[PDB]
Amino acid sequence: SVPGTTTDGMDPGVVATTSVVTAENSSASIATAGIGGPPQQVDQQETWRTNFYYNDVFTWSVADAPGSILYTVQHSPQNNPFTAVLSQMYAGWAGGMQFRFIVAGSGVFGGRLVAAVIPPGIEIGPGLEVRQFPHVVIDARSLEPVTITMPDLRPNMYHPTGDPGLVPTLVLSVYNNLINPFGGSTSAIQVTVETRPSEDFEFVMIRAPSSKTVDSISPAGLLTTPVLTGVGNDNRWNGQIVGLQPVPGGFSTCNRHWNLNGSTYGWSSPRFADIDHRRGSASYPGNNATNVLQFWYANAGSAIDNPISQVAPDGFPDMSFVPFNGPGIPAAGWVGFGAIWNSNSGAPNVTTVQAYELGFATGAPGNLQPTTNTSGSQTVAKSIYAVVTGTAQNPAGLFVMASGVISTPSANAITYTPQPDRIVTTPGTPAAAPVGKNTPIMFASVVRRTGDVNATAGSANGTQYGTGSQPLPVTIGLSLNNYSSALMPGQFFVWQLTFASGFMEIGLSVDGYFYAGTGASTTLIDLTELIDVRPVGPRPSKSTLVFNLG
Amino acid sequence: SVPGTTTDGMDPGVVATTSVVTAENSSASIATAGIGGPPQQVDQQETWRTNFYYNDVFTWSVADAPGSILYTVQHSPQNNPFTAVLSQMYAGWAGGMQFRFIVAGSGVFGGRLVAAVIPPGIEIGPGLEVRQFPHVVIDARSLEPVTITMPDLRPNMYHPTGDPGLVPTLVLSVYNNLINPFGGSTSAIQVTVETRPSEDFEFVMIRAPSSKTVDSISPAGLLTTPVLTGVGNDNRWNGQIVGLQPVPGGFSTCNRHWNLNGSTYGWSSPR
Amino acid sequence: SVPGTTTDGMDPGVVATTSVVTAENSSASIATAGIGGPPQQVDQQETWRTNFYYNDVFTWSVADAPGSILYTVQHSPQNNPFTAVLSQMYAGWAGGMQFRFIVAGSGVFGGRLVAAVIPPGIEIGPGLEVRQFPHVVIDARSLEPVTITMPDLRPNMYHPTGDPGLVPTLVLSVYNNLINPFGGSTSAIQVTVETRPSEDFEFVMIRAPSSKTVDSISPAGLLTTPVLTGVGNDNRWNGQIVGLQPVPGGFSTCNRHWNLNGSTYGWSSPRFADIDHRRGSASYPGNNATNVLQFWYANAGSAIDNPISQVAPDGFPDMSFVPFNGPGIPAAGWVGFGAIWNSNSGAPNVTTVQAYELGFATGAPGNLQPTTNTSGSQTVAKSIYAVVTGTAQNPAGLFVMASGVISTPSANAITYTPQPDRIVTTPGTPAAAPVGKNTPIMFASVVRRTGDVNATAGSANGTQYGTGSQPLPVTIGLSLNNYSSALMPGQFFVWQLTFASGFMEIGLSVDGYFYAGTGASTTLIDLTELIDVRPVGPRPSKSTLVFNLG
């Protein structure tokens, strides 16, 4: 006898068929994937083919209404961890994949789940009625696993590895409300999804692995475990990422931000080199030239140095200029050490070296006001400390070092200084907006300031944070590879961030912005107990990313 | 007609073989380990090798997330009591070892465990994912015991007792969260691990009692009963230890402090 | 009929046996790799198993003496491009591999090659007599391919994927001098090596690919094509790598340099953050405090801030201090913008902001002399331009920004400024020395200066170069992973850099230094027409790396 309480790795449990799984589909799938040649990696006795391996886990609570979606997977060789390795030596794939669900509940629970394979060409999200497709209904009291097969319903004769085309989507939604007849704090059970290729899965043509690599067919390898723990910086301050900042209002970052199409709207390369502009006018107030505040300005659009955009010099911060006058230190400003140099010889001036506040403004000879649009604006520098003399040369130049620190009027730290009310954006960049319970996030790094240059993380004076839209390895890999055929609009590419106590998901839209499903919470995420990052793949944007840190 | 509520000492229960237990692994283990001469203590009627005996017990809480480690042991003679007695009497070993798990829960509980055998070269830590190995899943409502045999996967021809080298590792983690539908104070059950050598386990060379090398006898002898309620002094002062106090936040002492690997970072020899 | 002039991909040509290939070795290899379980990926009709795929090409000239080694490969699943993909899902391997040699010569050429499989435990290099092993002799006039099989002569019962153990080595040396009876400029032919697994090759256990990944078993993925073209920086100046600098005398870099054991001797993390030191004495000369040169110094060894070494603060340059006085700009110095800050509050001073030269010196109150050893020395800063007033506080602090520029006394550029005569090294770091015709190389990046801040690559004023020991992605990946069981001492890990016109090899020693076989040439390599980088694996250090750029 074999009890139902212990299940083998190769045991499928009960096999739950659906009208979408037909012999005609299987025979047509084999017969027309044969245009790739003989099927490859089809040995039935291989260990990667015979066992089920983990794909996901999800929670089913009593508050989950009938029709609400709990699980959604897209047909891919990236669901299985071993067909994802084998796809790096083959140029195509076809066939189906089995999905084994193990429900972890007792015999006292009620409520049921429903499972349908959704054909390609149908939008996946809320309002998709899973119970009016051909479906299967699973109890909460299932002891044995329930494996359903996802066939290859494809309009192409095989899926190329780079662009697969249209694929089905397996949806597990709530059929009936899960009930606990006991009543109390214990109202949730868990369902584990595992996966294994079907008997008619195959790869079709071989190809050299030095062709389109793992970094060009999916953005799974961009956001790996050392990137988010201690190695990757951000794309604004070049500082070690120590957290995530949820932005419930939404923001819009243009500079050093790459979308999933391999394009940018900014004026900066994916690197932190210096800001060097030629022929911008420099000036200094009054008639006396001792301890004066050096000023520099140049119209946006006349920076003919960058092969990416003519708006601003490379590495210029996309922050509005905060106005200040006299010997008063401004609040929340990008300042960076630099100098004024004569354009005719390239020689920097001896005495005009200071920490210059860099930003975007509107009227440089008159009243200095901040701005966000680059149109009709100008890139404006002005030193925050005293400079002896000052170059009043009109064709003069400005050279400012790459990384920047925070201007703070006192020793005490302030909030994260690129707030969305002052981030400079060209006309045309799309904005990150909260979709469902998923709010956009930034990537906080500890950035020191001009009030305490000894201030580190956890300083008793107060810790200072600067935020970026993307990690630098993420936007470095996004500029080098194109992932248009990896995510439709209205979809996220989700990773899982396992922590020491909890676990929580982030997702990347086609715009390039990252999202965590935290709702309206503004509390910074610690990112210190982060142990593991793994990808799970394309998911709907209107499906809440999980977030529990307790 | 045993009802399943009472299990014999020799009864394994349901045998769950993942993908590592193969016949020709056993054949390539038995034939190869003849480099230690004739195999010793191989009599499959002796009671020390036919019965399951206690090794460890562990607690499965409702707060243990999926993927959390509950019970991991490297392949060793030390996972069995009588094999640990005989391992000081011999200088090499080979073969597998069965692990019988008995879950102490009623039929009202829910949640699953996952057990895999990890191959010898793999590093075991935070990044190891155990459900993406060939595994077996065990329910919290298991009445009969479940036996998972870890075979002897090895690149060496046998395992020296002082330097076994690369061994496989049985890893038992949480597959699904443990659920009590009542809630309340009861939030943890217990699993007892019994152990018994496999059909192909053996020793080879004899050697003098108490004489091996690396993997020095685990430091169970440096901390005994009197240390706390008798002799035994401190590092800064020479007084009896009257209590322990927990510091929230941590500390750092590097004067008379020696680490697992014998080394000090500082002055002041321990006297 | 099948002519010998056209050969199939699956055609082995003639099969050249050796006494090292025996039936007892094959049967023992199968019978004892069976302890891993059933053999995996052993389907004989698979396309990756049946075809030969490219491994290497090498040149055989008339100047190559009898006994000189032309080709050397180590037994590995990294020789084949498809067993290298399959090794990411398996925990072990065993069995042999075939090597197919196609000699490209006419029937007018003379001379012969010899081929032996060398057993493990034997040193590979010059003076290894291949003609006194069991061997096979191949003409220069061979029309059909010659395939010889490399058996698995192993003392382990299988090779684990991470550490394989002792493996054989296939050596192709010269048997007889290649002769052209014609005489002239055409004195070289080419031999192509291809590879295919043997019938008894296998993988033994499956494992999850999220285990020890491709970046931990071999350093092949560290030096990839975007790293050396336009993305990677260097570990000294954080600038885009535009070339390689051959150093025929040898050098020794300690700071921000990681070896293959995952260890460093430097005082810097693999990142370019700022230099922040507490309690170093600051001073300024004379009694007047206008336009004075600010000075700062602190003894090396009293920087209690770094969790890696107490020698110097994190990010401090390993360059000797070049002395200067008065209003004279020094030559070839690390200068970086910074300030002096009061240690009791962390507040930077308003007026002491300048471009400070940073270096290592010996006597700070007396005569400032340069130094290379860190022992008995001190980290010394001194501004290169005028600073109003100056903090004379003994417990004061220094904060200098991360990246540095060159100090140049005129507008004109100079040689690459971290010359090996001034690179600061702790006592204990090993030095890069020329082995054979292979000389160590650095990684030149265009670093701008204080004489022309508009100076870029190819400037009519003159281009300025700063060199580092390693690329930043290479030393970032070397700190995260340990490759002790990837290269024995006396070996290089070679990559191939294919250019538009030529192709040339670099190799990485266990010390962490890179080598190119260029002899005594000091000419900088252009690295602009670099199109492809691929790895080839462990090779002897006393075997000249190829170099032809024409």
CSV table of C-alpha atoms in Angstrom, one decimal, chain A residues 32-362:
chain,number,residue,atom,x,y,z
A,32,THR,CA,4.3,20.4,-37.3
A,33,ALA,CA,7.2,20.9,-34.9
A,34,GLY,CA,8.8,18.3,-37.1
A,35,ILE,CA,9.8,21.1,-39.4
A,36,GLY,CA,12.6,21.8,-37.0
A,37,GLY,CA,14.1,18.4,-37.7
A,38,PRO,CA,14.1,15.4,-35.2
A,39,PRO,CA,13.0,16.3,-31.7
A,40,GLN,CA,15.9,16.8,-29.3
A,41,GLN,CA,16.1,16.1,-25.5
A,42,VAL,CA,13.3,13.7,-25.7
A,43,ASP,CA,14.8,10.8,-23.7
A,44,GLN,CA,11.9,9.8,-21.5
A,45,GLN,CA,14.1,8.3,-18.7
A,46,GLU,CA,16.1,11.4,-17.9
A,47,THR,CA,15.9,12.8,-14.4
A,48,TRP,CA,15.1,16.3,-15.4
A,49,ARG,CA,12.1,15.0,-17.4
A,50,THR,CA,10.7,12.5,-14.9
A,51,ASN,CA,10.6,14.5,-11.7
A,52,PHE,CA,8.5,17.5,-10.7
A,53,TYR,CA,10.5,20.6,-9.7
A,54,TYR,CA,9.3,23.7,-7.8
A,55,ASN,CA,7.7,26.6,-9.7
A,56,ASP,CA,5.8,28.7,-7.1
A,57,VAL,CA,3.8,28.8,-3.9
A,58,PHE,CA,0.8,31.0,-3.2
A,59,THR,CA,-1.6,31.7,-0.4
A,60,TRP,CA,-5.4,31.2,-0.4
A,61,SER,CA,-7.2,33.2,2.3
A,62,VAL,CA,-10.8,33.4,3.4
A,63,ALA,CA,-11.1,36.9,2.1
A,64,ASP,CA,-10.4,35.9,-1.5
A,65,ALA,CA,-13.7,36.3,-3.3
A,66,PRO,CA,-15.0,33.8,-5.9
A,67,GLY,CA,-13.5,34.6,-9.3
A,68,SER,CA,-10.3,36.3,-7.8
A,69,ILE,CA,-7.1,35.0,-9.4
A,70,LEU,CA,-4.5,33.4,-7.1
A,71,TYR,CA,-2.1,32.0,-9.7
A,72,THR,CA,-1.2,32.7,-13.3
A,73,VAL,CA,1.6,31.1,-15.3
A,74,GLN,CA,2.6,31.7,-19.0
A,75,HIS,CA,3.6,28.8,-21.3
A,76,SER,CA,7.4,28.9,-21.5
A,77,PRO,CA,10.5,26.8,-21.0
A,78,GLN,CA,11.4,29.1,-18.2
A,79,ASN,CA,8.8,27.6,-15.9
A,80,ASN,CA,10.9,24.5,-15.5
A,81,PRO,CA,14.5,25.1,-14.1
A,82,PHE,CA,16.0,22.5,-16.5
A,83,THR,CA,14.3,23.3,-19.8
A,84,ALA,CA,15.5,26.9,-19.1
A,85,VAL,CA,19.1,25.5,-19.1
A,86,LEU,CA,18.5,23.5,-22.3
A,87,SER,CA,17.1,26.5,-24.1
A,88,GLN,CA,20.6,28.0,-24.3
A,89,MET,CA,21.7,25.5,-26.8
A,90,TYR,CA,18.6,25.2,-29.0
A,91,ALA,CA,16.9,27.5,-31.4
A,92,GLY,CA,13.3,26.5,-30.8
A,93,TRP,CA,10.8,24.5,-28.7
A,94,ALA,CA,7.3,23.1,-28.9
A,95,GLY,CA,5.0,20.9,-26.8
A,96,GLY,CA,3.3,21.2,-23.5
A,97,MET,CA,4.1,21.2,-19.8
A,98,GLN,CA,2.4,19.7,-16.7
A,99,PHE,CA,1.7,21.6,-13.5
A,100,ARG,CA,1.3,19.8,-10.2
A,101,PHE,CA,-0.6,21.5,-7.4
A,102,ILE,CA,-0.3,20.3,-3.8
A,103,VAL,CA,-2.9,21.9,-1.5
A,104,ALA,CA,-1.9,22.1,2.2
A,105,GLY,CA,-5.1,22.0,4.1
A,106,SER,CA,-6.8,19.7,6.6
A,107,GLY,CA,-10.1,17.9,6.2
A,108,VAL,CA,-11.8,20.6,8.3
A,109,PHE,CA,-11.5,23.3,5.6
A,110,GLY,CA,-14.1,24.1,2.9
A,111,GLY,CA,-13.9,26.1,-0.3
A,112,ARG,CA,-12.7,25.2,-3.7
A,113,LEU,CA,-10.3,26.3,-6.5
A,114,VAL,CA,-10.8,26.3,-10.2
A,115,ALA,CA,-8.3,25.8,-13.0
A,116,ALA,CA,-8.5,26.5,-16.7
A,117,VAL,CA,-6.0,26.8,-19.5
A,118,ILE,CA,-6.7,30.1,-21.3
A,119,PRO,CA,-6.1,30.2,-25.0
A,120,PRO,CA,-3.7,32.7,-26.5
A,121,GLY,CA,-5.1,36.1,-27.6
A,122,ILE,CA,-7.2,36.6,-24.5
A,123,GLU,CA,-6.4,39.3,-21.9
A,124,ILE,CA,-5.4,37.9,-18.5
A,125,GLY,CA,-6.4,39.8,-15.4
A,126,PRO,CA,-9.4,40.6,-13.1
A,127,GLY,CA,-12.7,40.1,-14.8
A,128,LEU,CA,-11.5,37.0,-16.6
A,129,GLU,CA,-14.1,34.5,-15.7
A,130,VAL,CA,-12.2,31.2,-15.2
A,131,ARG,CA,-15.4,29.3,-14.3
A,132,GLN,CA,-16.9,29.8,-17.9
A,133,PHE,CA,-13.9,28.1,-19.6
A,134,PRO,CA,-13.5,24.3,-19.6
A,135,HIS,CA,-12.1,23.9,-16.1
A,136,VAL,CA,-11.4,21.5,-13.2
A,137,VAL,CA,-12.5,22.1,-9.6
A,138,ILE,CA,-10.2,21.2,-6.7
A,139,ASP,CA,-11.2,20.9,-3.0
A,140,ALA,CA,-9.3,22.5,-0.2
A,141,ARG,CA,-9.3,19.0,1.3
A,142,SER,CA,-7.3,17.4,-1.5
A,143,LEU,CA,-4.6,15.0,-0.1
A,144,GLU,CA,-3.1,13.7,-3.3
A,145,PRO,CA,-1.5,16.2,-5.8
A,146,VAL,CA,-3.6,17.4,-8.8
A,147,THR,CA,-1.6,17.6,-12.0
A,148,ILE,CA,-3.1,19.3,-15.0
A,149,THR,CA,-1.4,19.5,-18.4
A,150,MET,CA,-1.0,22.7,-20.3
A,151,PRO,CA,-1.0,22.0,-24.1
A,152,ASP,CA,0.8,23.9,-26.7
A,153,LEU,CA,-2.0,25.9,-28.4
A,154,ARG,CA,0.2,27.9,-30.8
A,155,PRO,CA,-0.4,29.7,-34.1
A,156,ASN,CA,3.3,29.2,-35.0
A,157,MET,CA,4.7,25.8,-36.0
A,158,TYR,CA,7.3,26.1,-33.3
A,159,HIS,CA,8.3,28.7,-30.8
A,160,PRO,CA,11.7,30.3,-31.5
A,161,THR,CA,13.7,30.7,-28.3
A,162,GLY,CA,14.1,34.4,-28.6
A,163,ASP,CA,10.6,35.3,-29.6
A,164,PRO,CA,8.1,32.5,-28.9
A,165,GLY,CA,4.9,34.2,-30.1
A,166,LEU,CA,1.5,33.6,-28.7
A,167,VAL,CA,1.3,31.1,-25.8
A,168,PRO,CA,-1.6,29.9,-23.5
A,169,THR,CA,-1.8,31.0,-19.9
A,170,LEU,CA,-2.8,28.7,-17.0
A,171,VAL,CA,-5.0,30.5,-14.4
A,172,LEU,CA,-5.9,29.2,-10.9
A,173,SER,CA,-8.8,31.3,-9.6
A,174,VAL,CA,-11.1,30.9,-6.6
A,175,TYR,CA,-14.2,28.8,-7.3
A,176,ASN,CA,-15.7,29.0,-3.8
A,177,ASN,CA,-14.7,30.9,-0.8
A,178,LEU,CA,-12.3,29.1,1.5
A,179,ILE,CA,-14.0,28.7,4.9
A,180,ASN,CA,-12.6,27.8,8.3
A,181,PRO,CA,-15.5,26.7,10.5
A,182,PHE,CA,-13.4,27.5,13.6
A,183,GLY,CA,-13.1,31.3,13.3
A,184,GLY,CA,-9.9,33.2,14.3
A,185,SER,CA,-6.5,34.3,13.3
A,186,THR,CA,-5.8,31.1,11.2
A,187,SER,CA,-7.4,31.9,7.9
A,188,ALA,CA,-5.1,31.0,5.0
A,189,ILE,CA,-3.6,27.8,3.4
A,190,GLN,CA,-0.9,27.4,0.9
A,191,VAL,CA,-0.8,25.7,-2.6
A,192,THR,CA,2.6,24.7,-4.1
A,193,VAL,CA,3.0,24.6,-7.9
A,194,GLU,CA,5.6,22.3,-9.4
A,195,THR,CA,6.3,21.6,-13.1
A,196,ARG,CA,7.6,19.0,-15.4
A,197,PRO,CA,7.6,18.8,-19.3
A,198,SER,CA,5.0,16.8,-21.1
A,199,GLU,CA,5.7,13.8,-23.2
A,200,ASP,CA,5.4,15.9,-26.4
A,201,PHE,CA,7.7,18.7,-25.3
A,202,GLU,CA,10.9,19.0,-27.4
A,203,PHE,CA,13.5,21.3,-28.8
A,204,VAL,CA,13.8,21.5,-32.6
A,205,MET,CA,17.1,22.9,-33.9
A,206,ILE,CA,20.5,23.1,-32.3
A,207,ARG,CA,22.4,26.4,-32.2
A,208,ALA,CA,25.7,27.6,-30.8
A,209,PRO,CA,25.4,29.0,-27.2
A,210,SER,CA,27.6,32.0,-28.2
A,211,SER,CA,24.6,33.2,-30.2
A,212,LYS,CA,21.8,35.1,-28.6
A,213,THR,CA,22.7,34.4,-25.0
A,214,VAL,CA,20.7,34.1,-21.7
A,215,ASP,CA,20.9,37.9,-21.3
A,216,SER,CA,19.1,38.7,-24.6
A,217,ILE,CA,16.0,36.4,-24.5
A,218,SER,CA,14.7,37.4,-21.0
A,219,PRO,CA,15.7,39.9,-18.3
A,220,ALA,CA,16.0,37.3,-15.6
A,221,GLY,CA,19.7,37.6,-15.1
A,222,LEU,CA,19.8,41.4,-14.7
A,223,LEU,CA,18.3,41.4,-11.1
A,224,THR,CA,20.3,38.7,-9.3
A,225,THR,CA,21.2,38.2,-5.6
A,226,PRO,CA,24.5,40.2,-5.4
A,227,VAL,CA,23.0,43.1,-7.3
A,228,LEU,CA,20.4,43.9,-4.6
A,229,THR,CA,22.5,43.0,-1.6
A,230,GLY,CA,25.9,44.7,-1.7
A,231,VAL,CA,27.4,45.1,-5.2
A,232,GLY,CA,25.0,47.1,-7.4
A,233,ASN,CA,24.7,50.9,-7.2
A,234,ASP,CA,21.8,53.1,-8.3
A,235,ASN,CA,21.5,55.2,-11.4
A,236,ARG,CA,21.5,58.6,-9.7
A,237,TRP,CA,24.0,58.7,-6.8
A,238,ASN,CA,26.3,55.7,-7.5
A,239,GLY,CA,25.8,54.4,-4.0
A,240,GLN,CA,25.4,50.9,-2.6
A,241,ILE,CA,21.7,50.0,-2.6
A,242,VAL,CA,20.5,49.4,1.0
A,243,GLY,CA,16.8,49.5,0.5
A,244,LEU,CA,13.6,50.0,-1.6
A,245,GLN,CA,11.5,53.2,-1.3
A,246,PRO,CA,7.8,52.8,-2.1
A,247,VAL,CA,6.4,55.8,-3.8
A,248,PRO,CA,2.6,55.7,-3.5
A,249,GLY,CA,2.1,58.8,-5.6
A,250,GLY,CA,4.1,57.6,-8.5
A,251,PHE,CA,7.1,59.3,-10.1
A,252,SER,CA,8.8,59.8,-13.5
A,253,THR,CA,12.6,59.4,-13.9
A,254,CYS,CA,14.1,60.2,-17.3
A,255,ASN,CA,17.9,60.4,-16.9
A,256,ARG,CA,20.0,57.2,-16.9
A,257,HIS,CA,16.8,55.2,-17.1
A,258,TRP,CA,16.4,52.6,-19.8
A,259,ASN,CA,13.1,50.9,-20.8
A,260,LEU,CA,12.7,47.3,-21.9
A,261,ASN,CA,12.9,48.4,-25.6
A,262,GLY,CA,16.6,49.3,-25.1
A,263,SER,CA,15.9,53.0,-25.4
A,264,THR,CA,16.2,56.1,-23.1
A,265,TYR,CA,14.8,59.6,-22.9
A,266,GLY,CA,17.7,60.9,-20.7
A,267,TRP,CA,20.9,62.7,-21.4
A,268,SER,CA,23.3,60.2,-19.7
A,269,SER,CA,25.1,57.0,-20.5
A,270,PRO,CA,24.8,54.0,-18.1
A,271,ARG,CA,28.0,55.1,-16.3
A,272,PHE,CA,29.0,57.7,-13.8
A,273,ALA,CA,31.5,59.9,-15.5
A,274,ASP,CA,31.9,63.6,-15.1
A,275,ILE,CA,29.8,66.5,-16.4
A,276,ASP,CA,31.7,68.6,-18.9
A,277,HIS,CA,30.0,71.4,-20.9
A,278,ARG,CA,31.5,73.9,-23.3
A,279,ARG,CA,30.2,77.4,-24.0
A,280,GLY,CA,27.9,78.2,-21.1
A,281,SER,CA,27.9,81.7,-19.6
A,282,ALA,CA,29.4,82.2,-16.2
A,283,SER,CA,28.9,85.2,-13.9
A,284,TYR,CA,29.3,86.4,-10.3
A,285,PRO,CA,27.3,89.1,-8.4
A,286,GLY,CA,28.3,92.6,-7.4
A,287,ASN,CA,31.6,94.3,-8.2
A,288,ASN,CA,33.8,92.9,-5.5
A,289,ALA,CA,35.4,89.5,-6.2
A,290,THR,CA,36.3,88.0,-2.8
A,291,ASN,CA,34.2,85.2,-1.2
A,292,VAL,CA,31.6,85.5,-4.0
A,293,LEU,CA,29.3,82.7,-5.0
A,294,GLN,CA,30.3,81.6,-8.5
A,295,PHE,CA,27.5,81.1,-11.0
A,296,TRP,CA,27.2,79.3,-14.3
A,297,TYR,CA,24.3,78.7,-16.7
A,298,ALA,CA,23.7,77.3,-20.1
A,299,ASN,CA,20.5,76.8,-22.1
A,300,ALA,CA,19.2,73.3,-22.3
A,301,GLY,CA,19.4,72.1,-25.9
A,302,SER,CA,22.7,73.7,-26.7
A,303,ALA,CA,24.9,70.9,-25.3
A,304,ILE,CA,26.4,69.7,-28.5
A,305,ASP,CA,28.6,67.0,-27.0
A,306,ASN,CA,26.3,64.0,-26.3
A,307,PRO,CA,25.5,61.4,-29.0
A,308,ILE,CA,22.3,60.5,-27.1
A,309,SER,CA,20.5,63.9,-26.6
A,310,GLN,CA,21.5,67.5,-26.9
A,311,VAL,CA,19.5,68.6,-23.8
A,312,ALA,CA,22.1,68.5,-21.0
A,313,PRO,CA,25.7,67.3,-20.6
A,314,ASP,CA,26.4,63.6,-19.8
A,315,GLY,CA,25.9,62.8,-16.1
A,316,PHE,CA,23.9,66.0,-15.3
A,317,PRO,CA,21.5,65.4,-12.5
A,318,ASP,CA,17.8,65.4,-13.2
A,319,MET,CA,16.9,67.4,-10.1
A,320,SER,CA,15.4,70.9,-10.0
A,321,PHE,CA,17.6,73.7,-8.8
A,322,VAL,CA,16.7,74.7,-5.3
A,323,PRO,CA,17.3,78.5,-5.0
A,324,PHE,CA,19.5,80.0,-2.4
A,325,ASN,CA,21.4,83.2,-1.7
A,326,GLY,CA,24.0,84.4,0.7
A,327,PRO,CA,25.8,82.2,3.2
A,328,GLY,CA,22.8,79.8,3.7
A,329,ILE,CA,23.1,76.1,2.9
A,330,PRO,CA,20.1,74.9,0.8
A,331,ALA,CA,18.0,71.8,1.6
A,332,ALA,CA,17.9,68.6,-0.6
A,333,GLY,CA,20.2,69.6,-3.5
A,334,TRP,CA,22.5,67.7,-5.8
A,335,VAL,CA,26.0,69.2,-5.1
A,336,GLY,CA,29.2,68.0,-6.6
A,337,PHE,CA,32.8,69.3,-6.5
A,338,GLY,CA,34.0,71.0,-9.7
A,339,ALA,CA,35.6,74.0,-11.3
A,340,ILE,CA,35.1,76.6,-14.0
A,341,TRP,CA,37.5,76.3,-17.0
A,342,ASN,CA,38.4,78.5,-19.9
A,343,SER,CA,37.0,77.1,-23.1
A,344,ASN,CA,39.8,78.4,-25.4
A,345,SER,CA,42.6,76.3,-23.7
A,346,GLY,CA,40.8,73.8,-21.5
A,347,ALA,CA,42.7,75.0,-18.4
A,348,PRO,CA,40.7,75.0,-15.2
A,349,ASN,CA,40.9,78.1,-13.0
A,350,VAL,CA,43.0,77.9,-9.8
A,351,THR,CA,40.6,79.5,-7.4
A,352,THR,CA,37.0,78.7,-8.6
A,353,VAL,CA,37.0,75.2,-7.1
A,354,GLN,CA,34.1,74.5,-4.8
A,355,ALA,CA,31.1,72.3,-4.2
A,356,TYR,CA,28.6,73.4,-6.9
A,357,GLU,CA,24.9,72.9,-6.7
A,358,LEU,CA,23.7,71.5,-10.0
A,359,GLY,CA,20.1,71.7,-11.2
A,360,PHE,CA,17.6,72.9,-13.7
A,361,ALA,CA,16.2,76.5,-13.6
A,362,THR,CA,14.2,79.0,-15.6
